[PDB]
Amino acid sequence: APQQINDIVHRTITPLIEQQKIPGMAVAVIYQGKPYYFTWGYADIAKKQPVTQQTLFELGSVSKTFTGVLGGDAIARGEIKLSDPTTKYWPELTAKQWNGITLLHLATYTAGGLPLQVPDEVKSSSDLLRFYQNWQPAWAPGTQRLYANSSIGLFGALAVKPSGLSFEQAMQTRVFQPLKLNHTWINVPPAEEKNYAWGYREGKAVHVSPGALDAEAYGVKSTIEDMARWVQSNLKPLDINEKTLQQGIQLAQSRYWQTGDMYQGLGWEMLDWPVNPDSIINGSDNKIALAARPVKAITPPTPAVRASWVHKTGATGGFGSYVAFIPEKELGIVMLANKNYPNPARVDAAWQILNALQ
Ligand SMILES: [Cl-]
Ligand code: NA
């Protein structure tokens, strides 16, 4: 790796790991479009299994960027439109409150107060229907942004209906396989479990449990190599051979809503580069990132802006992830850790590295 990258990564990540007591971590820096990998610590403490470039991490909500791109791909194929009402694809929901909620609202958390988590007691398709049927919105659609698994998770489930594929099959055939993400999984195959790191919560090893819409909202596991390639693809979509996938990535980084300094894409979130680091650092705190905030529609949606800070945080019980990149600079970073540690610490480290390398 270039000496500049080694210097800043070891200056930044090494103190972070000790200060946060992170058992194992993998970092990829994309510099001038090429990836450079770094690994620390253990994927399994008890068995002393080290983290490698093959170690699988739970991505948590970084999975939402795959869902956003998969939906974008379906838009580009002419299968769905963001302005379509939810009831076109789930007619059993036909009701006053749901006729005015579109796929855009679901994809961008602007449906009007869909909850952060799907209740743990929702365990069947009938449970899920009844859950959305009896949901009482708090705001009119298109006025408030409330980050929610039950929002974009439903977008992913509905966006694949016209394809006739399951969500996993559509993701595998339309995103993972064309991009050669051969070690990225919604369901880890038996032969790959050996690489599945343990997450650690309060000194206990944990893996994320099955939940309704987990695959769409937080159920992807990946290696640092595949995630570096995911950043490469989102940095340089025009190099992708499949037109609809290139366009899906561009659609996912387009700006549909504005809240303060940030713009909402499909899965991805964007700010104008250069950014005020305090904005994204403090803005990643859950007291802020999970709060309801008013939105302004952007008309037409702004096409993917090159001078952007594009990023997404992710968390499960035992894992914490972060992805950020700057298309104008061909510059990005992936941070995967098997402990869920505060988002502001992730963003601070990521910005220090990318700002030093611009
Ligand atoms: Cl390695
Ligand atoms: Na609206």
Binding residues: 61, 117, 147, 149, 315, 340
CA of 296 to the centre of ligand 2 (A): 9
Among the listed residues 183, 195, 192, the one whose alpha carbon sits nearest the alpha carbon of residue 49: 195
Strand partners, 315: 320
Residue 201 CB-density burial (10 A; 0-12 exposed, 13-18 middle, 19+ buried):
middle
Among the listed residues 234, 241, 257, the one whose alpha carbon sits nearest the alpha carbon of residue 312: 234
CA of 84 to the centre of ligand 2 (A): 11
Strand partners, 324: 311, 333
Pairing of β 221-222 and β 255-259: unpaired
Ligand nearest to the CA of 28: 1
Q: Which two tokens stand for residue 59?
A: 């991505």
CB 232 within 8 A of CB 257: no
Ligand nearest to the CA of 101: 2
Ligand nearest to the CA of 26: 1
- Count the neighbouring beta carbons within 10 Å of the beta carbon of residue 282: 16
User: What angle, 0 to 180 degrees and rounded to 10, lies between the N-to-C axes of helices 63-76 and 243-252?
Assistant: 120
CA of 192 to the centre of ligand 1 (A): 16
CB-based contacts of 185, cutoff 8 Å, min separation 6: 56, 192, 220, 221, 222
CA 296 to centroid of chain Cα atoms = 22
CA of 18 to the centre of ligand 2 (A): 46
CB-based contacts of 2, cutoff 8 Å, min separation 6: 31, 36
CA of 145 to the centre of ligand 1 (A): 40
Q: Per residue, what are the HEC states of the chain?
A: CCHHHHHHHHHHHHHHHHHHCCCEEEEEEEECCEEEEEEEEEEECCCCEECCCCCEEECHHHHHHHHHHHHHHHHHCCCCCCCCEHHHHCHHHCCHHHHCCEHHHHHCCCCCCCCCCCCCCCCCHHHHHHHHHCCCCCCCCCCEECCCHHHHHHHHHHHCHHHCCCHHHHHHHHHHCCCCCCCEECCCCHHHHHHECCEEECCEEECCCCCCCHHHHCCCEECHHHHHHHHHHHHCHHHCCCHHHHHHHHHHCCEEEEECCEEECCCCEEEECCCCHHHHHHHCCHHHHCCCEECEEEEEEECCCCCEEEEEEEECCCCEEEEEEEHHHCEEEEEEECECCCHHHHHHHHHHHHHHHC
Strand partners, 321: 314, 336
Report the distance separating Cα 162 and Cα 170, nearest Å. Answer: 11
Q: Is 61 a catalytic residue?
A: yes
Resolution for this experimental structure (Å): 2.0
Catalytic residue among 61, 222, 233, 284: 61
Domain boundaries, the chain: 1-358
Residue range 1-358, CATH number: 3.40.710.10
CA 81 to centroid of chain Cα atoms = 21
| C-alpha triplet 322, 238, 304: angle, nearest 5° | 60
Binding residues for a beta-lactam: 61, 117, 147, 149, 315, 340
